[PDB]
Each structure stands twice: as C-alpha cells, then as structure tokens.
Amino acid sequence: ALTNNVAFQTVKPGNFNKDFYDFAVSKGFFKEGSSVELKHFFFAQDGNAAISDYDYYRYNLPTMCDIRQLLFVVEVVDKYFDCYDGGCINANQVIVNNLDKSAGFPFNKWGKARLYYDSMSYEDQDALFAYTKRNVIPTITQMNLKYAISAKNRARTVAGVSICSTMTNRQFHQKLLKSIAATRGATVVIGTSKFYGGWHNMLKTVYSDVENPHLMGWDYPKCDRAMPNMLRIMASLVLARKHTTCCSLSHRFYRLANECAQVLSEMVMCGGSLYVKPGGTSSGDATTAYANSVFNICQAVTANVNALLSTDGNKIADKYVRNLQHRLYECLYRNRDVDTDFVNEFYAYLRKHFSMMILSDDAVVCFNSTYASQGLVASIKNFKSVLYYQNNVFMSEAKCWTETDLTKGPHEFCSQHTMLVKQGDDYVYLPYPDPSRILGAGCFVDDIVKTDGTLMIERFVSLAIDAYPLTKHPNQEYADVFHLYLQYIRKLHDELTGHMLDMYSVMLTNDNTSRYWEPEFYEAMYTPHT
Amino acid sequence: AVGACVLCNSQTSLRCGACIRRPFLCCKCCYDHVISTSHKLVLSVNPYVCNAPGCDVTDVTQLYLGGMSYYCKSHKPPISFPLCANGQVFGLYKNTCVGSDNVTDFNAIATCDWTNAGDYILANTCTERLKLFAAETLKATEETFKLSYGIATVREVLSDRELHLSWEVGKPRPPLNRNYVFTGYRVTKNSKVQIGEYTFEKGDYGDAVVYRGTTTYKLNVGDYFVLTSHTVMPLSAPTLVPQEHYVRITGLYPTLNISDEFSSNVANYQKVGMQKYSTLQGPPGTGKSHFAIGLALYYPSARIVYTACSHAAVDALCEKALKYLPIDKCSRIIPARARVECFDKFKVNSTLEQYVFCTVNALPETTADIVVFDEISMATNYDLSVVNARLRAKHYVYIGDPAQLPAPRTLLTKGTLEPEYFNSVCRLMKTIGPDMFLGTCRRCPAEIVDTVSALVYDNKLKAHKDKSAQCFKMFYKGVITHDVSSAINRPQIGVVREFLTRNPAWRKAVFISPYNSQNAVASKILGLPTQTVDSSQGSEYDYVIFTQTTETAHSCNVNRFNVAITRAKVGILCIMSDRDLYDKLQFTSL
Amino acid sequence: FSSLPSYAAFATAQEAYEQAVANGDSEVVLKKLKKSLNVAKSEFDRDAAMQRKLEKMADQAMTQMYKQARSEDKRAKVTSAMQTMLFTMLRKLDNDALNNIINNARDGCVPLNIIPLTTAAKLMVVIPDYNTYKNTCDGTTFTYASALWEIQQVVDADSKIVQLSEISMDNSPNLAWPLIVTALRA
Amino acid sequence: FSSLPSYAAFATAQEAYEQAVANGDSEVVLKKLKKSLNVAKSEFDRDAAMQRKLEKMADQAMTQMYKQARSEDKRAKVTSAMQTMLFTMLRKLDNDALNNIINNARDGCVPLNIIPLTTAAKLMVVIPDYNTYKNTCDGTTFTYASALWEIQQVVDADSKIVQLSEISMDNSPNLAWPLIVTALRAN
Amino acid sequence: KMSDVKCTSVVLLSVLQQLRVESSSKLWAQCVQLHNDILLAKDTTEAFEKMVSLLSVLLSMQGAVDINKLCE
RNA sequence: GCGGUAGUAGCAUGCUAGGGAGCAG
C-alpha cells in the first residue's frame, strides 16, 4: 500500500444539450416507432469501479502453445512482413505528437512530458537507450477510467504507462512503425484514410481475384486480457526481427527483457496500492495496434494450418494440394529447419486463396468458397477451435458475420457499414455510420464542449462531414439526419452573427461560410483527388 | 464577467483596475476616467499590460495591440495598433455603450478619500448607483484604514486570563473595549496555525491586558496575535424604494378599535397602508417605539420584525415589545459569537418567530410583513441598501429624528456631517418630512427639556412631565490619567462614590459620560450602573450619573450631552465640564 | 476605405487625366499624368490594403473575446441553470404520479428515504399538520405516489407512538404536528 | 530606420531636388535631380531592407533564448523535488529487521515480494463483506503470514470510525461495505 | 416519448451529483444503479417506476426550495 | 523601341511550426 486510506473512483453522468434535442423533435424526430432512436449514452459508474474491473485478469491463464507448429507459423507470419524497414535511431529523429499527455507515476506529480522531454539533452536520452541494452528497469503503471460515450454499461480502463518506457521504445521502434504506417496497398492497413475514395481502394484490393469469394469477419472475446504471454513475446520478436544491424545479440535480448518487464507483467498502481499483472497485454504502450495486428494474423494462419491437416487424406483431389499437405506435415514435424522454398510456396498459396485485410485486432477475410466446404481454408468452426485451445476463451458464433454476395460489401469493419452507390458515373463504396451514434453524440457531452453550441459549431461541421454518406441511403429517416445537421448548422450560425450584430452591433463584414450550410462542400470529400 | 457601466449604465466589460472597487465602465466612460485622474489600469478578459516579458506599463495608452497580446511601446511589432483610440478604449460593446458626463463626480469619488465633509455631502448627494458605490468605497477606505494598524505580542502571560503585552515598533495601539479581537500563533518558525479568537481589555492595574480566548491555547512568552477582521462585500439594493399610493390598505386585517395608550396613533397607523413605506419624526422617547408597538399589533398577527442600529436600542425596544406585545409570539435574536449580553427574555435566536427582533449586524436576509427600522438617523446609506436587499415585505417603517446622533463615522474627523446628509431617509425627513408625527413625551423632566430646547432642539420642543428637581450639577476637576482613546475621571467619580451616600433615589442611576474606557473603569469605581453616551439614546431610564470628564468636543458636544439628558425618566446627575454649558443647565451643584 | 487622403489625391489625378484624354492632347502629357496616376494609385491602394487588414485583425480579436467571455460565465452559473432546466422538463413530462409527489412535496409531506417499489419495504412520511394528515390518511389506508400504503405506526415530534384516531382535529393542538408516519405497500 | 546615413543622403538629394525644382530649370537639372533621387532611393532600399531582417531575427533570438533558460530552470526544480521525495521515502525503512534479512541472503539478492511482507509493520486490510470479516479478521487480533497482528481502527467507505462492536451479522446491512481494518505488526 | 424520460434522467442525476450527494456511499450506489438502468429501458412503465423511486431521493434533500421553482 | 536588375502591392503553391475540435482501434 502507500497511503493510509484507499481512494474510490466515480464517473459522473454526461450532461444534456437540450436545445439541439428540442430542435430535433421540432423536425419531427423521435416520433414513436422511429427506426432511429437514441442508443449510445454516457453511462455512470459507482464507487469500486477500477478494482472491480482490473479483477478481470483472472480470465488470463498460463498456457503452453504447441512448440513445433509455433516455430513454423512464426516464420510464415514473418514472411508477411518483408516489405518494411527499421532499426535503432537517435534522439533527433523520434517524433512526438501532442507532447503534453500524462506521464504515469510518480512523474505526474510534476507535470506532463514537456519537462522530461525538455529537461534532458539528446545525450541524456542516448545514454538511457544505449544503457538499457544491457540492464533491466522494472516500472509501474497507472489505470485510468475512460469517460466517453458507449453502449454497454461496463467499465473501461486504459493503462497509462510511465515515461521511462515510451521514451525508449519509441527510439527503438520508430523507424519501422512509420514504415508500416505509411505504405499503401498491403495486408496491414493501419493508416489509410477512408476519405477521397481511399476506402473503395482498400476493398478493391482485398478482393483481388479469389475464385469463389465469400466474406467473413470475426471478433475477439475479451481480446487484451486473455491473450496468453507466449503470443505477446511472439509479437515482440517478429517486430524486432528487422533490427539485425543496429542491434547485436545481448543488446536485443536485454531489450526484449526490458519490454517484457515494462508491458507484460509488472506492477499496476491501480487505485492507491500495488498489485501484479499476471499476464495479458496492456493497451497503452508504444507498440500496440501493430502488435495486436500481428498476433491477429498469427491466429488466422494457425487456423488455416489446422484446417489443412485436420482434413482427411484420400479425398483431396488436386494431386498438387495433396502433395502440399503431405509436404507440409513433413516440414513441420519431421524436419528441423526451415524450407524457404516451402514457406514461400505456402505464403503464395494463401495469398491466392485466403486474402486478408487487418486493422489492429479487426479483420476481414475474402476466401475461396468451395475450398471452405472442402475444408482447405479455415472457415469459422476452426476459429472456434483455436480460440479455444490456445486462447482458452469461447468465441460465440453470434458475432462472426458471413457474406456470399460481394457487391454490397462486407457487413461492418471498423464500425462502418458499407453501401455501394453511384458517384458521377461509376460505382463506389462509401462507408456510413450507425445513425444512432451520430445523434446520440449530438445531444450528450461534457460541458462547454457542448451545453451551448453557439461557441462551437466546428463540432457540428465535423459531425456532418462524417454523416454525409447517409444521404444515399434508401431508407428515409437516415437521409434526414443529414438534412437536420445541415439546417441546424445554418440556423446556429445565423444567430451567432445576429448576436454579434445585436448586443455589440459589430456586424461581421462578409460571408464565405455559406459553403458550410450547403452540401457541396462535403460530398467533394468522398471523391478521389487531392 | 460583464455588466453595466456603473456610471454611464452602458453594458460593458471593463474594470478600472487602478481603482480599489474595479467597477464596470463603458468604453467611453472608461476612456474619460483613464484620461482624467490618476487611475491608469484597465482590465478585461485579461489585464491590459505590457505583455513583453520585462516591460511593465500601467496606463493602456502606450499599450499596443501586438499580434494577439499587448505590448508597451518598445515591443510594438510592426503589425501593431494602439489600444487607446480616438475617444474610446477597445474592449467590447464597441458601438453599444453610451457614455455619460458625470465624469465629474466619478473622478471626485474615485480620487478622494472621505477626508472631506464635501466628500460626504457629494457621496450622499451624488447618483444612486454612485451613492452605493461611494458607500462601498467608503467601507473600503475604512477597511484599509483598519488594516494600516499594527500587531500585538506578549511580554509575558500574567494569568490564564490576565496577560502582559506590547506591540511592535510604534504601530498605533487602538482603543480598548471588546471591538478589538485578535488571533495568535505559536510559531516554531513553522506551526503558524490560527490559535483562535481573542479579544483584549484593560487590566485592573498597570501593565495588564485581560484576554478572552475562544481556544484553549495556553499562551507563553514567544507569543503574538493579529487584529482579525472581516471583508466587506458589494451590494446592489437601492438606498431607497419607490413611494407609491394604493387605494387603501388591502389584503390585510388590522386591529379594530385598539386601545388608549395607542389611541393617538391609529390614524397614523392606517396611514401606514396608504403610503408604500412610512416614517415617524418625533421627540426623543415620545410614545415613539410605543407607537411602533401599537402599530405592529395594530395588525395583530403579521410577519413583523423590530430592528434598529445598535445593541441597547433594539434591546430596550424589544423589552418594550415584551412589555406590550405577548411574549409568546416574540423572539429576540442575538449574534453568534455574541460577546455582548443583552435583553434575551424571549425564545432567543429562535429564527422562525412571527415578531422577530435582530440588529443589522447580521439581520438574516428574509421576507416579512411591515417591518420597522428604528433610529434611521444613526446608520449610513450603505446600511439602508443592505437592509433593503436582505428584506422583502409590504411596508417599511423608518423612524428617526436626525437631532439624534448618528454613526460614529470615526473617519469623519474634520468638517462634520450635516443633518439630512447622514443618509437617504435623513434627506427624506429633513425634506419631505416624516410620514407621520406625534410631538410630546411622557418620559423626561421639564427643566431638562428647557435645557435641551435652547441647545439642539428649539424651544418648540415641549414634553409632558414636571420639574422634580432630581437634577444637579458640579464643576470640579482633578485627575485625568487617560489611556487609549477613552479618558477617565478618578476624583470626580470618587466624589460621586461618596455622593452615592448623599441622596437615596440615586443608588440605581446609570454612569454615563462621553467615553468608553471611562465607563469601563467606572465598574471598578463603585460597581455603578453605567452606559457610554452612545449606548444610551432613545431610551428612558430614571437616573443617570453623568460625569462629563474631559473637555474635548467629543466630551462636550451639545448632542452627546443632549442624548445623555433625553433619557432621564426622573432626573440627572451631571458634574459639569464647560462653565458656559455648566451654567447652561439650571440646577444646584455642591 | 473611400475616405482617406490618398483617396483624395487619387480622385484629383484621375479627374485631370480623364479631362485630358477627354480633351485630346499630346502623347507626352499623357505619359506625365499616367506616371502621376500610377503613383497616386500604387500608394493609395497600399494604404487601403493594410487598413482593411488591421480592420480585420480587430474584428477577429473582438469576436474571439466575446466567445471566451460568454463561455466562462456560463461555466459559472451551471447550478441554477441545471435546476430550472430540470423542473421545466418535469412539468413538461407531466405525470400525475410525478405531479402527485411533487405537489405534495411542495405542500409539506416529504419522504425520509428512497421511495421503494416492492410490496414490502415500508416508507416514512413526514406530515406537518392534521389537515395535511387528513387529505391522504383516510382510515388505515394511504394514497401516495399513487400507491396504496397501509399504516403501521404514528408518532409526533418528540417520538411518542401516538395512536391512530387518538389525535383528532379538535384535540390536534394536543399533538406536535411533525408527524413521522410509516406505512407499507399494497 | 531614420538614423541612417542613407537617410542623410536621400534627404539632401531631395533638398537639392526641391531646390532646383521649385526653381525648376532645364532638362539637365531635372536629370541630375531624378538621377540623384533614383540612386538615393537605391540606398534606402537595401538599408530599409536588410534592417528589417536584422530586427526580426534579433527578436526571434531573444524569444528562443528565454525559452532555453526557462527549460533549464525547471529542470533544476524537478531535480530538487525528486531527490527530496526520494529521501523522505528513504528514512522510514532502515529497520534492523531488514538489515538482518539481507545479511541472511545467499548473495545480497532477495526477491521483492517478501520484503514488505516480512519486514513491514502497519497492515491495512480491505474487506467486502461481513462474512469475510468474521472469517478472516474476527476477534481483536489474528495471525497471518505467520505473525500476529492487532486491530486498531476499522474505518469504512466514508471514513467513519466504526468500533469492533457494531459489526454484527445484522447491523451489517446498514454499513458502507468495503471496510478497512488498520491492524498492526503485533509483537 | 420515453426518450425524454431517458433525457430527464440524465439531467437529474447530474443535479444530484452536483448537490454533493456522493459524500455518502450507499446513496451513490442506489442512484448510479437507477441511472444505468433506465438508460437501458424498454417500456415507459417500469421507467416511470425507477424515475420516481429516484426523484424522491432528491426530494428528501433540503438543498432545493422547490416551493420557489414551482413558480411556473 | 527591346533585356536584365531593383523594389513594391497583388495572387497562387507548398512547407513549416502554433493552437481549437471530430472519428476509428
């Protein structure tokens, strides 16, 4: 413990935004039986919120994951990452955004990262870095309660990490992390806008000629508590693989050690006291969304490997594929060392019959249908089996959609539905969002961030630019929600200049704005060009 | 925040920080101020200063709009732009604010310091908004004045109740009563925590100071206190409300056919419901508080409050209520820390009375029915605003006679105040008269009203009593040791001590004389009932041993003598001071 | 900004050059005045440009300031805003159960703990006079929150279990009226 | 930008120009005039040019220098506060019992999870229920981690002191429930 | 309709918050429960139930002088 | 009569840094 009395947390309600809502009903909304109706809200949480949540790590077990097939699908996954580059850098090359966030504990008794990124030379930071390549630095961590709109009354936590970790893991990974972030047209798609028809391009990629195509997604039940450790180490290793020159050996090994002490299983200053974090990842360090994606690919592959071998032997028709499977087993158990010929062969086989697009822990796979029925590509039931025997949770089948027509696109990826509609002359995919989200984000806020939009507006802009695609929808009330947001923004602005002309007659001398309360400024958005 | 131009009414967004009140000024009026007097500091949603790191400027003249901040001359980036501009100052309401031309008295109050009878008469004859403003900057001057003083530390603690103290190097030691309260610290370099409230009084002999402490901290030799103080707050209520008619008295039910000791009153009483508020001019103790009693009961059951300026005044008034009004519907309220112990015969401090009684010093801000104020001619316009705010009702009775002394105004030192200029309703009565009248007493002798009739009042004041010849003088002098702002007599009061054997009816007088510590030592003298001249007033008791000690103006004022003599039911002792005045009152001496 | 010295000179020079090229004259005087016109223009326009610039800077800072000021002060009156919003919202919602309790609470009766819902779970009412007692309490039954409570006690201010129709309006001044009644749900 | 020698030269070039222009003479007079004025213009251009650059750059230098200064100064403040917190943490631990436990080491290395357990004193305990109360910290004392402990005060959620009496089985449903027992290293 | 019920509830719990009710515990518990529930309601009835079974919480307080606000 | 240079003001493009806000994981 530390204090002499524990601290209790609470999460206030959200606050209302009456007017906009009064507007909304005045336009004939929420008239009963509507197909749009509030559904996201600011849920409130009582006293013992944190620890009554951090308890969930008891969902995390030890595990032994089979060693041979792991020592192989790490190689295939590796092959998925041969188009980037990274290595150690130097102080004057890291790049921080919003260098003003928290700084974990106890450094948060003294100010944000302005100080520590400021009160240190570059040589300071380089001593630090090229120090931890030979030592260990156990750290702490804080747990924070998020306060933002939702749809399920549970808690939320985010692990604010202490500065001496990020301040190195950056230096050690930045080159790669960029190289991934800024490449167009591949598997991992972290960082590719959905504006200006980049979304449509994402799809017309992840199609790419697989013969009999069906679409399937899935989702991971409690993704970041239950991930066993072995897979976390596997992620960190596949990332460090490209460090073959900057580093050495013992440099790496201590660097891995410093990471596994700083994010995997170190103490957790939850509340006013210290615990231990037995395992599982931690959604706040320097290398998440990437590591989550990698792990995810590891699951998808392992599922396919099982789906292959599990199949009988003497019903496979394509003598080529039978000789594949056979060769596969041989390389997997009998052999000892890699068959680069075979590995390249496999990777190609997958790209041909099981293409996949990945965001950090959020997938879509387009796959060769009749194969599935023949079991040479991991249809869902294999996902049940893997999540079981090596994530030891149970992925219900009420969450993994599946799609046979490919026109009207997938079902939901990164929480947008995908309509296919006619732009100009041709046909493109616009992603549009669950309307209730847009509304129930209009009416509930923190305080001044709304309570009174007349100061703000800029929000209402961004919201409308985000709920434009709903103008194309064949349902009705949907398209309305756009025309609402419009006539709103307009009237709002009108009263603003009214006041600045009324109290203080200082009439504002020109317009320009009128592009806002007219749709053309938006739709230009979803259209390829600049 | 925002508001209106405290003078030009214009809604604005400035505060002349150079002021001590920092009020809301229109752009134009602010311009005129910052051009006129010395006040050169302007605040809005930030201050207007030389936001250069090193540069510091008071006025906003050489202040230039730089980028988005401000600068003096020396940092004016060439995208500059002066703030002070062509007879306006940039702020808000750029084009709305309408200036006003009482720049005159605006400067006159913003610059002065109540040194002047002129400063007062303007302050009590300026505009209403400026009237309250003058009022609060008056209290502000008062508070700064009180702040200017010094500190008291200990030489040694003689007793747990008796202490031996001193002050710092020279800093002025105030007078002595209970109106001087302190709070100390046992500072072990640190450990400087409040050690509680302590008031201080004269020891019984020599260098001694009797301290009453609220805490139980045993004081030692390395100990000290600070004279503790409040902080006055702004107000907003007008000093006066609109007087209007009705058709009659509607919505209430009076006392049909009341009585005879209240007979000469019901006409007046009904006049209550005709004028929106009412008042009474009358001679000192003239059925006056009696009249108020008969009126408040003239409506038998109502949310009534009896209240006045001082302690003993409202005390005797509420004993008067008691004496007439049924005590069962009566509650006398007193203050909290309440180091004063008073007539407390009802349910004390019991808030929800129907006939509530409390002094202004913390009149609980409530609504009521016809409330009366008593001794209007005492307090300041500030107070009248304060009570107007705290209170809500139907009819507001303000009784007084500015021939009765008013506030101490211990800042008012040179160039006294003149009658109506005491406060607003003083202007009312001195001009528009009272709202009712009755003009004779039941309460004081005839020779004594002959005394008071050639001095303060006119001979036109004629009471209803007789000469009982229980009024005698003297002119003898001797010791005047004096202490701090309250000088005493020893041989005059000792001749009084042997004189306590002279005439029987004088073993229950009241020791009165124009000094505080004088009457305080008077308890050490013979254990004689006493009263400082102010602690009397309006009342009427039988005998008063007046020992006019010193011969300063505060000691020989005609009005302080008059309020000493307007309270004698039966007679006066007064061993006089000014042979001119000593013969102005007409008795035998010895 | 059609009101500046350079504007005046511009106008004069324009007038002269227009008169000339209207009167017809030498190619050479054309060049004189045309240079002159160029001068007047290419300074007047500059002053007017920078002027409207400064004008706009002023307007922008002013409107930002207004934003900020009204913002903060609203942040300061959050409380009273909230409550008045609530009550208008409630009588807007209009429910005779809600109205029931609300009117009653303004009347005098207020409960002394969360009003529960089950058949069990007594509640405590505070009724402040006989008449206030007489309007709900009619026999041992009890309408409040449009719910039927049966009584199981009565007690005046100083905690004396005083019986049911023991008190009576006539003999009511026999009783401290801060009655602290209890009851249970139908 | 007036105290410039070029300003003297351009100013006198004018002086002569209005001298021979008010006394307007010949095309050569006009020629000398226009020539001088064109070239003294030329002197003014660069002076009134580069000088702007010098000035603006001076100013930005002053800015950045202030900034560097403030940075280092706050570095000083942080180092101070850091060490002082460190030492106020330190001088509360050097119990002999530790020095014992570290001598007893095989090497001078002990895993951390058995230092606060064995050597530390004042114990806090959280409790969610009455049952767990009466099963684990019932009575006035108890052993745990193989050592005795004494109850001091039993505060609750609102930090209201609660005697060891009120905690009946049935006074329980009247309590904020996660009571904090502050026991002590009994010895 | 009911949608306004959910809204009113949000306003309301915000009020009870700022009245410093969270110094209690068990209060804040029962309240946050009623809130978190109606914000998942389904039929106006049991809503109105939890609504009043909350509101009275506030009524039992004495920070509000509702005899004022019912000025209309 | 034509080139280059020199300033000016205008217009564009981009890049920088600086704040304000929105979304997905």
Added chain:
RNA sequence: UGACUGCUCCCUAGCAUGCUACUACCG
C-alpha cells in the same frame, strides 16, 4: 485523476517558390 497510435476539418504565424502589376535601374 486522462495511455499509445492513425486519419481528417477550421483558424493563425513563418517560409519558399510561384504567379501578376507598379515604379527605378542598366542593354
């Protein structure tokens, strides 16, 4: 008491270029 990323809109400041006219300069 507020984590690591990624995509966007609006408003400044600097910069470069780039465009255009004016004016002066030399052929």
